[PDB]
PDB file of C-alpha atoms (C1' of nucleotides) and ligand atoms in Angstrom:
ATOM      1  CA  UNK A 242       0.000   0.000   0.000  1.00 18.44           C
ATOM      2  CA  UNK A 243       1.952   3.074   1.335  1.00 15.88           C
ATOM      3  CA  UNK A 244       4.821   0.509   1.826  1.00 15.26           C
ATOM      4  CA  UNK A 245       5.233   0.113  -1.991  1.00 16.68           C
ATOM      5  CA  UNK A 246       5.390   3.946  -2.407  1.00 17.15           C
ATOM      6  CA  UNK A 247       7.951   4.177   0.505  1.00 16.18           C
ATOM      7  CA  UNK A 248      10.123   1.448  -1.198  1.00 14.41           C
ATOM      8  CA  UNK A 249      10.083   3.297  -4.565  1.00 12.31           C
ATOM      9  CA  UNK A 250      11.071   6.612  -2.872  1.00 12.28           C
ATOM     10  CA  UNK A 251      13.760   4.766  -0.787  1.00 10.60           C
ATOM     11  CA  UNK A 252      15.474   3.722  -4.083  1.00 12.63           C
ATOM     12  CA  UNK A 253      16.248   7.427  -4.679  1.00 14.37           C
ATOM     13  CA  UNK A 254      17.862   8.193  -1.249  1.00 12.72           C
ATOM     14  CA  UNK A 255      21.422   9.563  -1.385  1.00 12.37           C
ATOM     15  CA  UNK A 256      22.783   7.619   1.636  1.00 14.73           C
ATOM     16  CA  UNK A 257      23.435  10.624   3.901  1.00 15.35           C
ATOM     17  CA  UNK A 258      21.633   8.702   6.675  1.00 17.29           C
ATOM     18  CA  UNK A 259      20.951   5.084   7.776  1.00 17.10           C
ATOM     19  CA  UNK A 260      18.399   2.968   5.887  1.00 17.95           C
ATOM     20  CA  UNK A 261      16.211   2.981   9.044  1.00 19.90           C
ATOM     21  CA  UNK A 262      16.291   6.857   9.370  1.00 21.02           C
ATOM     22  CA  UNK A 263      15.407   7.278   5.641  1.00 18.68           C
ATOM     23  CA  UNK A 264      12.516   4.760   6.024  1.00 20.24           C
ATOM     24  CA  UNK A 265      11.051   6.611   9.082  1.00 18.17           C
ATOM     25  CA  UNK A 266      11.396  10.010   7.266  1.00 19.01           C
ATOM     26  CA  UNK A 267       9.679   8.669   4.090  1.00 22.40           C
ATOM     27  CA  UNK A 268       6.945   6.801   6.071  1.00 21.71           C
ATOM     28  CA  UNK A 269       6.176  10.020   8.072  1.00 26.09           C
ATOM     29  CA  UNK A 270       5.908  12.067   4.805  1.00 30.23           C
ATOM     30  CA  UNK A 271       3.822   9.460   2.877  1.00 31.59           C
ATOM     31  CA  UNK A 272       1.359   9.144   5.829  1.00 32.44           C
ATOM     32  CA  UNK A 273       0.737  12.982   5.796  1.00 31.32           C
ATOM     33  CA  UNK A 274       0.153  12.929   1.998  1.00 32.35           C
ATOM     34  CA  UNK A 275      -2.178   9.842   2.146  1.00 32.59           C
ATOM     35  CA  UNK A 276      -5.353  12.018   1.994  1.00 29.34           C
ATOM     36  CA  UNK A 277      -3.683  14.552  -0.386  1.00 30.23           C
ATOM     37  CA  UNK A 278      -3.581  12.583  -3.728  1.00 25.75           C
ATOM     38  CA  UNK A 279      -2.367  15.531  -5.898  1.00 26.27           C
ATOM     39  CA  UNK A 280       0.554  16.403  -3.534  1.00 28.18           C
ATOM     40  CA  UNK A 281       1.607  12.688  -3.215  1.00 27.51           C
ATOM     41  CA  UNK A 282       1.560  12.322  -7.079  1.00 25.00           C
ATOM     42  CA  UNK A 283       3.696  15.488  -7.422  1.00 25.31           C
ATOM     43  CA  UNK A 284       6.194  13.956  -4.901  1.00 26.10           C
ATOM     44  CA  UNK A 285       6.433  10.501  -6.613  1.00 24.15           C
ATOM     45  CA  UNK A 286       6.731  12.127 -10.097  1.00 22.56           C
ATOM     46  CA  UNK A 287       9.424  14.615  -8.879  1.00 20.84           C
ATOM     47  CA  UNK A 288      11.554  11.990  -7.007  1.00 19.83           C
ATOM     48  CA  UNK A 289      11.121   9.114  -9.610  1.00 17.00           C
ATOM     49  CA  UNK A 290      12.211  11.345 -12.594  1.00 18.52           C
ATOM     50  CA  UNK A 291      14.935  13.190 -10.563  1.00 19.99           C
ATOM     51  CA  UNK A 292      13.101  16.519 -11.031  1.00 20.82           C
ATOM     52  CA  UNK A 293      13.302  16.221 -14.857  1.00 18.19           C
ATOM     53  CA  UNK A 294       9.900  17.883 -15.488  1.00 17.56           C
ATOM     54  CA  UNK A 295       8.661  20.856 -13.357  1.00 21.00           C
ATOM     55  CA  UNK A 296       6.629  19.741 -10.307  1.00 20.48           C
ATOM     56  CA  UNK A 297       4.058  21.412  -8.017  1.00 22.39           C
ATOM     57  CA  UNK A 298       4.467  22.040  -4.222  1.00 22.67           C
ATOM     58  CA  UNK A 299       4.469  19.079  -1.752  1.00 24.51           C
ATOM     59  CA  UNK A 300       3.472  20.446   1.667  1.00 25.37           C
ATOM     60  CA  UNK A 301       3.244  19.365   5.277  1.00 23.45           C
ATOM     61  CA  UNK A 302       2.103  21.433   8.295  1.00 20.23           C
ATOM     62  CA  UNK A 303       4.812  23.522   9.967  1.00 21.44           C
ATOM     63  CA  UNK A 304       5.470  22.961  13.699  1.00 23.14           C
ATOM     64  CA  UNK A 305       5.555  26.040  16.034  1.00 22.11           C
ATOM     65  CA  UNK A 306       9.375  26.029  16.144  1.00 20.73           C
ATOM     66  CA  UNK A 307       9.815  24.897  12.494  1.00 19.88           C
ATOM     67  CA  UNK A 308      11.669  21.647  13.164  1.00 19.64           C
ATOM     68  CA  UNK A 309      10.223  18.216  12.300  1.00 22.00           C
ATOM     69  CA  UNK A 310      11.142  15.231  14.541  1.00 21.64           C
ATOM     70  CA  UNK A 311      11.915  11.866  12.875  1.00 18.72           C
ATOM     71  CA  UNK A 312      13.155   8.894  15.009  1.00 19.88           C
ATOM     72  CA  UNK A 313      14.223  11.163  17.886  1.00 18.24           C
ATOM     73  CA  UNK A 314      16.013  13.732  15.712  1.00 17.66           C
ATOM     74  CA  UNK A 315      14.843  17.274  14.899  1.00 21.41           C
ATOM     75  CA  UNK A 316      15.623  19.159  11.681  1.00 23.95           C
ATOM     76  CA  UNK A 317      14.003  21.620   9.282  1.00 26.60           C
ATOM     77  CA  UNK A 318      11.584  19.491   7.149  1.00 28.91           C
ATOM     78  CA  UNK A 319      12.636  20.918   3.765  1.00 29.21           C
ATOM     79  CA  UNK A 320      16.316  20.230   4.773  1.00 28.59           C
ATOM     80  CA  UNK A 321      15.528  16.630   5.868  1.00 32.62           C
ATOM     81  CA  UNK A 322      13.911  15.765   2.510  1.00 30.43           C
ATOM     82  CA  UNK A 323      16.459  17.716   0.361  1.00 31.29           C
ATOM     83  CA  UNK A 324      19.346  15.886   2.226  1.00 31.12           C
ATOM     84  CA  UNK A 325      17.541  12.568   1.689  1.00 27.74           C
ATOM     85  CA  UNK A 326      16.866  12.868  -2.072  1.00 30.47           C
ATOM     86  CA  UNK A 327      19.430  15.392  -3.455  1.00 32.18           C
ATOM     87  CA  UNK A 328      22.328  16.582  -1.200  1.00 29.78           C
ATOM     88  CA  UNK A 329      23.387  13.974   1.445  1.00 33.12           C
ATOM     89  CA  UNK A 330      26.057  16.354   2.895  1.00 32.34           C
ATOM     90  CA  UNK A 331      23.632  19.363   2.984  1.00 32.33           C
ATOM     91  CA  UNK A 332      24.185  21.827   5.860  1.00 35.25           C
ATOM     92  CA  UNK A 333      22.202  24.780   7.312  1.00 33.65           C
ATOM     93  CA  UNK A 334      21.570  27.960   5.192  1.00 32.84           C
ATOM     94  CA  UNK A 335      22.527  26.146   1.940  1.00 31.22           C
ATOM     95  CA  UNK A 336      19.025  26.105   0.390  1.00 30.13           C
ATOM     96  CA  UNK A 337      17.279  28.671  -1.767  1.00 31.70           C
ATOM     97  CA  UNK A 338      13.745  28.228  -3.020  1.00 34.68           C
ATOM     98  CA  UNK A 339      12.776  28.641  -6.695  1.00 33.44           C
ATOM     99  CA  UNK A 340      10.635  31.748  -7.620  1.00 31.38           C
ATOM    100  CA  UNK A 341       7.486  29.666  -8.408  1.00 33.02           C
ATOM    101  CA  UNK A 342       7.472  27.869  -4.985  1.00 35.50           C
ATOM    102  CA  UNK A 343       4.543  29.342  -3.003  1.00 35.29           C
ATOM    103  CA  UNK A 344       4.978  27.330   0.254  1.00 35.88           C
ATOM    104  CA  UNK A 345       8.790  27.512   0.730  1.00 35.72           C
ATOM    105  CA  UNK A 346       9.982  27.321   4.367  1.00 34.71           C
ATOM    106  CA  UNK A 347      11.276  31.002   4.184  1.00 33.08           C
ATOM    107  CA  UNK A 348       7.784  32.247   3.073  1.00 34.40           C
ATOM    108  CA  UNK A 349       6.490  31.677   6.696  1.00 36.40           C
ATOM    109  CA  UNK A 350       3.318  29.752   5.776  1.00 35.44           C
ATOM    110  CA  UNK A 351       1.700  27.095   8.070  1.00 38.40           C
ATOM    111  CA  UNK A 352       2.182  24.740   5.030  1.00 35.93           C
ATOM    112  CA  UNK A 353       5.882  24.033   4.234  1.00 33.84           C
ATOM    113  CA  UNK A 354       6.987  22.813   0.798  1.00 34.18           C
ATOM    114  CA  UNK A 355       9.260  19.738   1.169  1.00 35.27           C
ATOM    115  CA  UNK A 356       9.630  19.191  -2.617  1.00 35.84           C
ATOM    116  CA  UNK A 357      13.485  18.942  -2.922  1.00 38.89           C
ATOM    117  CA  UNK A 358      13.281  20.179  -6.568  1.00 39.93           C
ATOM    118  CA  UNK A 359      11.649  23.408  -5.245  1.00 41.17           C
ATOM    119  CA  UNK A 360      14.998  24.327  -3.709  1.00 42.98           C
ATOM    120  CA  UNK A 361      18.469  24.795  -5.153  1.00 39.90           C
ATOM    121  CA  UNK A 362      21.813  24.592  -3.324  1.00 43.88           C
ATOM    122  CA  UNK A 363      23.718  27.801  -2.452  1.00 44.44           C
ATOM    123  CA  UNK A 364      27.024  28.560  -0.609  1.00 44.13           C
ATOM    124  CA  UNK A 365      26.642  29.320   3.164  1.00 43.40           C
TER     125      UNK A 365
ATOM    126  CA  UNK B  27      14.310  27.567  47.430  1.00 42.95           C
ATOM    127  CA  UNK B  28      11.994  24.787  46.034  1.00 44.11           C
ATOM    128  CA  UNK B  29      15.103  22.525  46.545  1.00 42.82           C
ATOM    129  CA  UNK B  30      14.801  22.832  50.380  1.00 39.07           C
ATOM    130  CA  UNK B  31      11.063  21.890  50.196  1.00 41.14           C
ATOM    131  CA  UNK B  32      11.910  18.908  47.855  1.00 42.45           C
ATOM    132  CA  UNK B  33      14.607  17.705  50.374  1.00 44.78           C
ATOM    133  CA  UNK B  34      12.151  17.872  53.322  1.00 45.05           C
ATOM    134  CA  UNK B  35       9.490  15.907  51.350  1.00 43.12           C
ATOM    135  CA  UNK B  36      12.193  13.400  50.167  1.00 42.46           C
ATOM    136  CA  UNK B  37      12.866  12.517  53.864  1.00 42.43           C
ATOM    137  CA  UNK B  38       9.332  11.040  53.997  1.00 40.40           C
ATOM    138  CA  UNK B  39       9.587   8.764  50.880  1.00 39.16           C
ATOM    139  CA  UNK B  40       8.922   5.057  51.501  1.00 36.32           C
ATOM    140  CA  UNK B  41      11.652   3.698  49.166  1.00 35.11           C
ATOM    141  CA  UNK B  42       9.340   2.033  46.623  1.00 35.29           C
ATOM    142  CA  UNK B  43      11.397   3.749  43.892  1.00 33.92           C
ATOM    143  CA  UNK B  44      14.965   5.038  43.274  1.00 36.77           C
ATOM    144  CA  UNK B  45      16.136   8.269  44.932  1.00 37.41           C
ATOM    145  CA  UNK B  46      16.337   9.860  41.442  1.00 36.52           C
ATOM    146  CA  UNK B  47      12.692   8.863  40.519  1.00 37.08           C
ATOM    147  CA  UNK B  48      11.374  10.219  43.879  1.00 31.75           C
ATOM    148  CA  UNK B  49      13.320  13.499  43.337  1.00 27.38           C
ATOM    149  CA  UNK B  50      11.872  14.001  39.792  1.00 26.21           C
ATOM    150  CA  UNK B  51       8.309  13.201  41.068  1.00 23.61           C
ATOM    151  CA  UNK B  52       8.637  15.663  44.011  1.00 19.92           C
ATOM    152  CA  UNK B  53      10.307  18.391  41.852  1.00 16.63           C
ATOM    153  CA  UNK B  54       7.465  18.087  39.246  1.00 16.21           C
ATOM    154  CA  UNK B  55       4.795  18.412  42.020  1.00 14.22           C
ATOM    155  CA  UNK B  56       6.519  21.311  43.887  1.00 13.72           C
ATOM    156  CA  UNK B  57       6.943  23.274  40.594  1.00 14.29           C
ATOM    157  CA  UNK B  58       3.128  23.018  39.884  1.00 13.68           C
ATOM    158  CA  UNK B  59       2.310  24.203  43.446  1.00 13.64           C
ATOM    159  CA  UNK B  60       4.864  27.111  43.336  1.00 14.15           C
ATOM    160  CA  UNK B  61       2.136  29.700  42.499  1.00 13.98           C
ATOM    161  CA  UNK B  62      -0.455  27.911  44.724  1.00 15.25           C
ATOM    162  CA  UNK B  63       0.790  28.792  48.293  1.00 15.11           C
ATOM    163  CA  UNK B  64      -2.246  27.315  50.157  1.00 12.69           C
ATOM    164  CA  UNK B  65      -2.056  23.931  48.314  1.00  9.42           C
ATOM    165  CA  UNK B  66       1.779  23.700  48.814  1.00  8.51           C
ATOM    166  CA  UNK B  67       1.351  24.449  52.598  1.00 11.00           C
ATOM    167  CA  UNK B  68      -1.353  21.742  52.847  1.00 10.07           C
ATOM    168  CA  UNK B  69       1.097  19.278  51.155  1.00 10.02           C
ATOM    169  CA  UNK B  70       4.123  20.097  53.413  1.00  9.67           C
ATOM    170  CA  UNK B  71       1.921  20.008  56.579  1.00  7.13           C
ATOM    171  CA  UNK B  72       0.286  16.666  55.538  1.00  4.28           C
ATOM    172  CA  UNK B  73       3.588  14.905  54.576  1.00  5.25           C
ATOM    173  CA  UNK B  74       5.750  16.384  57.469  1.00  6.99           C
ATOM    174  CA  UNK B  75       3.219  15.317  60.212  1.00  8.69           C
ATOM    175  CA  UNK B  76       2.369  11.960  58.495  1.00  8.53           C
ATOM    176  CA  UNK B  77      -1.274  13.052  58.045  1.00 11.70           C
ATOM    177  CA  UNK B  78      -1.712  13.542  61.831  1.00 15.69           C
ATOM    178  CA  UNK B  79      -4.083  16.542  61.495  1.00 20.94           C
ATOM    179  CA  UNK B  80      -6.752  16.724  58.709  1.00 22.16           C
ATOM    180  CA  UNK B  81      -5.459  18.436  55.535  1.00 23.97           C
ATOM    181  CA  UNK B  82      -7.097  20.164  52.539  1.00 21.15           C
ATOM    182  CA  UNK B  83      -6.866  19.018  48.852  1.00 20.78           C
ATOM    183  CA  UNK B  84      -3.527  19.281  46.942  1.00 21.51           C
ATOM    184  CA  UNK B  85      -4.349  19.384  43.218  1.00 23.87           C
ATOM    185  CA  UNK B  86      -2.633  19.263  39.858  1.00 20.70           C
ATOM    186  CA  UNK B  87      -4.236  19.411  36.379  1.00 21.24           C
ATOM    187  CA  UNK B  88      -5.395  16.069  34.967  1.00 22.07           C
ATOM    188  CA  UNK B  89      -3.985  14.961  31.581  1.00 22.17           C
ATOM    189  CA  UNK B  90      -6.463  13.815  28.845  1.00 18.67           C
ATOM    190  CA  UNK B  91      -5.704  10.128  29.503  1.00 22.19           C
ATOM    191  CA  UNK B  92      -5.259  10.546  33.301  1.00 21.23           C
ATOM    192  CA  UNK B  93      -1.648   9.383  33.547  1.00 20.02           C
ATOM    193  CA  UNK B  94       1.202  11.681  34.646  1.00 19.06           C
ATOM    194  CA  UNK B  95       4.693  11.104  33.145  1.00 22.11           C
ATOM    195  CA  UNK B  96       7.742  11.383  35.451  1.00 21.96           C
ATOM    196  CA  UNK B  97      11.261  10.513  34.114  1.00 21.02           C
ATOM    197  CA  UNK B  98       9.857   8.515  31.181  1.00 22.16           C
ATOM    198  CA  UNK B  99       7.295   6.570  33.226  1.00 21.21           C
ATOM    199  CA  UNK B 100       3.505   7.032  33.208  1.00 19.24           C
ATOM    200  CA  UNK B 101       1.200   6.379  36.169  1.00 19.89           C
ATOM    201  CA  UNK B 102      -1.953   7.771  37.769  1.00 19.94           C
ATOM    202  CA  UNK B 103      -0.792  10.916  39.692  1.00 23.00           C
ATOM    203  CA  UNK B 104      -2.639  10.131  42.943  1.00 21.08           C
ATOM    204  CA  UNK B 105      -1.075   6.585  42.813  1.00 21.59           C
ATOM    205  CA  UNK B 106       2.453   7.973  42.177  1.00 19.68           C
ATOM    206  CA  UNK B 107       2.306  10.261  45.240  1.00 19.09           C
ATOM    207  CA  UNK B 108       0.488   7.721  47.511  1.00 15.91           C
ATOM    208  CA  UNK B 109       3.169   5.056  46.579  1.00 15.17           C
ATOM    209  CA  UNK B 110       5.907   7.620  47.272  1.00 16.72           C
ATOM    210  CA  UNK B 111       4.740   8.807  50.724  1.00 16.39           C
ATOM    211  CA  UNK B 112       2.526   6.001  52.166  1.00 17.18           C
ATOM    212  CA  UNK B 113       2.384   2.586  50.372  1.00 14.87           C
ATOM    213  CA  UNK B 114       5.620   1.725  48.447  1.00 14.93           C
ATOM    214  CA  UNK B 115       4.131  -1.608  47.196  1.00  9.77           C
ATOM    215  CA  UNK B 116       0.794   0.036  46.141  1.00 12.41           C
ATOM    216  CA  UNK B 117      -0.896  -1.511  43.074  1.00 14.20           C
ATOM    217  CA  UNK B 118      -3.821  -0.500  40.800  1.00 16.27           C
ATOM    218  CA  UNK B 119      -7.422  -0.263  42.210  1.00 14.97           C
ATOM    219  CA  UNK B 120      -6.144  -0.253  45.837  1.00 13.95           C
ATOM    220  CA  UNK B 121      -7.081   3.373  46.644  1.00 13.22           C
ATOM    221  CA  UNK B 122     -10.310   4.823  47.967  1.00 12.43           C
ATOM    222  CA  UNK B 123     -10.808   8.522  48.544  1.00 11.91           C
ATOM    223  CA  UNK B 124     -12.122   9.953  51.836  1.00 14.69           C
ATOM    224  CA  UNK B 125     -15.700  11.464  51.803  1.00 20.29           C
ATOM    225  CA  UNK B 126     -14.456  15.084  52.272  1.00 20.23           C
ATOM    226  CA  UNK B 127     -12.050  14.948  49.250  1.00 19.27           C
ATOM    227  CA  UNK B 128     -13.628  17.114  46.512  1.00 18.57           C
ATOM    228  CA  UNK B 129     -10.961  16.622  43.775  1.00 23.13           C
ATOM    229  CA  UNK B 130     -10.315  12.841  44.046  1.00 25.34           C
ATOM    230  CA  UNK B 131      -9.179  11.152  40.800  1.00 25.32           C
ATOM    231  CA  UNK B 132     -12.507   9.113  40.641  1.00 30.83           C
ATOM    232  CA  UNK B 133     -14.590  12.370  40.818  1.00 26.31           C
ATOM    233  CA  UNK B 134     -13.566  13.158  37.150  1.00 23.52           C
ATOM    234  CA  UNK B 135     -12.503  16.786  37.717  1.00 23.64           C
ATOM    235  CA  UNK B 136      -9.800  18.567  35.604  1.00 21.55           C
ATOM    236  CA  UNK B 137      -8.051  19.121  39.018  1.00 21.72           C
ATOM    237  CA  UNK B 138      -6.826  15.850  40.640  1.00 24.17           C
ATOM    238  CA  UNK B 139      -6.128  15.615  44.377  1.00 21.65           C
ATOM    239  CA  UNK B 140      -2.665  14.058  44.968  1.00 22.50           C
ATOM    240  CA  UNK B 141      -2.825  14.435  48.789  1.00 20.34           C
ATOM    241  CA  UNK B 142      -1.912  10.835  49.893  1.00 19.29           C
ATOM    242  CA  UNK B 143      -3.867  11.341  53.178  1.00 19.52           C
ATOM    243  CA  UNK B 144      -7.018  11.974  51.053  1.00 18.31           C
ATOM    244  CA  UNK B 145      -6.957   8.301  50.088  1.00 17.96           C
ATOM    245  CA  UNK B 146      -7.033   5.093  52.101  1.00 18.24           C
ATOM    246  CA  UNK B 147      -5.836   1.629  51.033  1.00 21.54           C
ATOM    247  CA  UNK B 148      -8.384  -1.060  50.054  1.00 22.15           C
ATOM    248  CA  UNK B 149      -8.117  -4.705  48.809  1.00 23.44           C
ATOM    249  CA  UNK B 150      -8.167  -5.116  44.963  1.00 22.06           C
TER     250      UNK B 150
ATOM    251  C1'  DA C 202     -16.715  -2.738  23.935  1.00 19.44           C
ATOM    252  C1'  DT C 203     -13.465  -0.728  26.850  1.00 19.55           C
ATOM    253  C1'  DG C 204      -9.153   0.307  28.835  1.00 20.54           C
ATOM    254  C1'  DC C 205      -4.039  -0.714  29.628  1.00 22.37           C
ATOM    255  C1'  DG C 206       0.368   0.490  28.352  1.00 23.70           C
ATOM    256  C1'  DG C 207       4.251   1.693  25.857  1.00 19.46           C
ATOM    257  C1'  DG C 208       6.405   4.199  21.396  1.00 18.96           C
ATOM    258  C1'  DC C 209       7.203   8.470  19.596  1.00 16.76           C
ATOM    259  C1'  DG C 210       6.294  13.492  17.956  1.00 16.33           C
ATOM    260  C1'  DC C 211       5.302  18.572  18.961  1.00 15.36           C
ATOM    261  C1'  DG C 212       5.176  21.894  22.543  1.00 16.32           C
ATOM    262  C1'  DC C 213       7.485  23.850  26.320  1.00 12.59           C
ATOM    263  C1'  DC C 214      11.554  24.860  28.443  1.00 12.64           C
ATOM    264  C1'  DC C 215      16.096  26.553  29.283  1.00 11.02           C
ATOM    265  C1'  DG C 216      21.125  26.745  28.899  1.00 12.22           C
ATOM    266  C1'  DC C 217      24.124  28.281  25.767  1.00 13.14           C
ATOM    267  C1'  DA C 218      26.595  30.569  21.410  1.00 11.26           C
ATOM    268  C1'  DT C 219      26.775  34.356  18.996  1.00  9.54           C
TER     269       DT C 219
ATOM    270  C1'  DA D 177      18.533  40.391  21.401  1.00  7.52           C
ATOM    271  C1'  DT D 178      17.802  36.348  18.909  1.00  9.76           C
ATOM    272  C1'  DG D 179      18.024  31.651  17.683  1.00  9.14           C
ATOM    273  C1'  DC D 180      20.138  26.837  18.102  1.00 11.97           C
ATOM    274  C1'  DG D 181      19.565  22.536  20.020  1.00 15.46           C
ATOM    275  C1'  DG D 182      18.650  18.936  23.012  1.00 17.25           C
ATOM    276  C1'  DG D 183      15.762  17.023  27.350  1.00 19.45           C
ATOM    277  C1'  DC D 184      11.450  15.591  28.562  1.00 19.64           C
ATOM    278  C1'  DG D 185       6.123  15.603  29.156  1.00 20.52           C
ATOM    279  C1'  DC D 186       1.251  15.259  27.169  1.00 21.62           C
ATOM    280  C1'  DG D 187      -1.251  14.059  23.147  1.00 21.71           C
ATOM    281  C1'  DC D 188      -1.939  10.793  19.642  1.00 21.92           C
ATOM    282  C1'  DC D 189      -1.711   6.314  18.238  1.00 21.90           C
ATOM    283  C1'  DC D 190      -2.306   1.433  18.060  1.00 22.28           C
ATOM    284  C1'  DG D 191      -1.609  -3.382  19.403  1.00 23.14           C
ATOM    285  C1'  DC D 192      -3.139  -6.104  22.781  1.00 22.56           C
ATOM    286  C1'  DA D 193      -5.737  -8.290  27.117  1.00 22.26           C
ATOM    287  C1'  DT D 194      -9.825  -8.921  28.876  1.00 20.37           C
TER     288       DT D 194
HETATM  289 CA1  LIG E 148       3.528   1.159  22.652  1.00 21.36          CA
HETATM  290 CA1  LIG E 149      18.218  24.132  28.248  1.00 21.46          CA
HETATM  291 CA1  LIG E 150      22.157  25.096  26.119  1.00 20.58          CA
HETATM  292 CA1  LIG E 151      23.812  32.981  26.291  1.00 20.70          CA
HETATM  293 CA1  LIG E 152      23.963  27.515  22.300  1.00 17.92          CA
HETATM  294 CA1  LIG E 153      18.387  20.267  26.052  1.00 16.95          CA
HETATM  295 CA1  LIG E 154       0.220   0.102  19.873  1.00 16.84          CA
HETATM  296 CA1  LIG E 155      -0.382  -3.557  22.561  1.00 18.66          CA
HETATM  297 CA1  LIG E 156      -7.611  -6.940  21.456  1.00 21.46          CA
HETATM  298 CA1  LIG E 157      -3.125  -5.219  26.223  1.00 18.90          CA
HETATM  299 CL1  LIG E 158      19.612   8.586   3.002  1.00 17.51          CL
HETATM  300 CL1  LIG E 159      21.924   7.753  10.291  1.00 15.48          CL
HETATM  301 CL1  LIG E 160       0.920  17.598   7.379  1.00 20.05          CL
HETATM  302 CL1  LIG E 161      12.984  28.393   1.957  1.00 17.16          CL
HETATM  303 CL1  LIG E 162      10.391   6.310  47.058  1.00 18.13          CL
HETATM  304 CL1  LIG E 163      13.086   3.100  40.608  1.00 16.84          CL
HETATM  305 CL1  LIG E 164      -0.958  21.554  37.646  1.00 17.81          CL
HETATM  306 CL1  LIG E 165     -10.119   8.414  43.555  1.00 16.52          CL
HETATM  307 ZN1  LIG E 166       7.244  24.499  -3.399  1.00 20.59          ZN
HETATM  308 ZN1  LIG E 167      -8.537  15.666  48.215  1.00 16.37          ZN
END
DNA sequence: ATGCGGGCGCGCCCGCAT
DNA sequence: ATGCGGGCGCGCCCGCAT
């Protein structure tokens, strides 16, 4: 079910973390997008094609402090998913959202875009 | 400050738990009663005299599920403090509140009485 | 049907760097 | 002044006993 989607997204991880951390991060994301068909499809299409064709926002609700907790660890959610699918060595203040992204973390919306192809890497 | 109150209440623990668990449980309780002078005085007087002279209710806010967490462990708050100051071997369904107790756990109020001398031990 | 009981995240907290 | 960052509790969840 969601397990087959998680496995397909797992195939595109960059190895910056353990298999078990990546699994928990992907499971957490897929569960939030379960009742949001359009956002889930935009995520699978963006990850599966390695952001070949422009994709739409993939959002989750922002926490009060901005960090998302996965398997006991807290990090910014857009950073967690960009590290996982694009830049395994990604550090803080190294992301810049694309002009068309309407729910980017920096835009201070209760909905945060975690589409890794909605961000580009910059020098800190 | 609250540390001197915690030490005086610690002297009356029955040893059912570790020194460190008892300390965390007492610290948590004292902190909640810090801005409730009358309730804190009723607690110190009841514990210090071993419930010699009738005491008034000592309440904390009830959680949605009824259990209080102290140092990673969950238990009913009236049970935690009765185990700590009166019955170290206390088990579930072995407590019965006194007729004058208005905030007893069984009375389903958002305020729970944790005065151990507001309960008496019964057979389960 | 109803509750226990334990895993784990978000909210609160607070010490610390800058 | 402002934010990081990690500890820990209450809320949510869910498997399980009864
Ligand atoms: Ca559990
Ligand atoms: Ca701190
Ligand atoms: Ca600190
Ligand atoms: Ca400081
Ligand atoms: Ca610091
Ligand atoms: Ca900490
Ligand atoms: Ca469960
Ligand atoms: Ca279970
Ligand atoms: Ca069952
Ligand atoms: Ca069970
Ligand atoms: Cl990874
Ligand atoms: Cl890891
Ligand atoms: Cl969400
Ligand atoms: Cl951003
Ligand atoms: Cl004890
Ligand atoms: Cl113990
Ligand atoms: Cl309280
Ligand atoms: Cl009761
Ligand atoms: Zn976006
Ligand atoms: Zn009472």
